[PDB]
Design a protein around this ligand. Sequence first.
Ligand SMILES: [Fe+2]
Length: 300
Amino acid sequence: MRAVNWNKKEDDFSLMFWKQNIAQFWTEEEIAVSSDKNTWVQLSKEEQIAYKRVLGGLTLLDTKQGGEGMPLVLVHLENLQAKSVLAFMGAMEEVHAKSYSHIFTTLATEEEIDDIFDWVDNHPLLEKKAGIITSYYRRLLKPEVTKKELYMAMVASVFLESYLFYSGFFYPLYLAGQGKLTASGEIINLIIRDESIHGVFVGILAQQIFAELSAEEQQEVQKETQELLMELYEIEMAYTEEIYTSIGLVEDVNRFVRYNANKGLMNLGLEPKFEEEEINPIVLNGLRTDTKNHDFFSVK
Ligand SMILES: [Fe+2]
């Protein structure tokens, strides 16, 4: 049947995204994380635990996005060029998942790693948020899907990649911005840089499909989008509360969540939901300065 033909455009953006995606490729081997021990051992129990929790949580999300979300969305696309980009995004999800193990391996012992994975696995909130997302992917497990079903699986993917990670990314950024666990912060920054072009791109794909829904499908899809947002917001607020009260950050993580929920919506070409809140200046600093870009030996 059809072979991908990159010499003839299937759309106006897949090639630019393909090139951006591959230009960003990295792998954990390029970031030694061992000198982070020095700041790791200065943190308290409650801070350690919290950092382990949010990383286990991020791992679950990359586990799902790379093992079901991208495979199940891409396989029903007719655009072979967009298909190639999603396939590559899925592999990077797995590079991301595994970098968390890379970090774990310098921070915690086996037994400690075991408990994180056990806690992640048996965690009811993670099952609920991840299940909500996943049910949209598992709906595509059949030979033919509706446009509505494909749109919605893409709504769910941009919610996961632009929004649901960020209750977790908050912590390592927060510490990096203060000089703590900065090699890991670098890894977390590369993950964000991929995640955020992942979100833009599926957002674009979602918007083309939207433009082809019947006027009233468009309504059902709007309505369902909003309820999905708020049902995840509700579970993110409980998640926040249970992760971040013991170290006093809840309301700071919350503002960061709504901030990202907004970029999520915007990626879908939708109006923002929350009023413009400023982001914690110490997370701003982790994002801006704890990057692999900044990390090199000056020749001066
Ligand atoms: Fe990721």
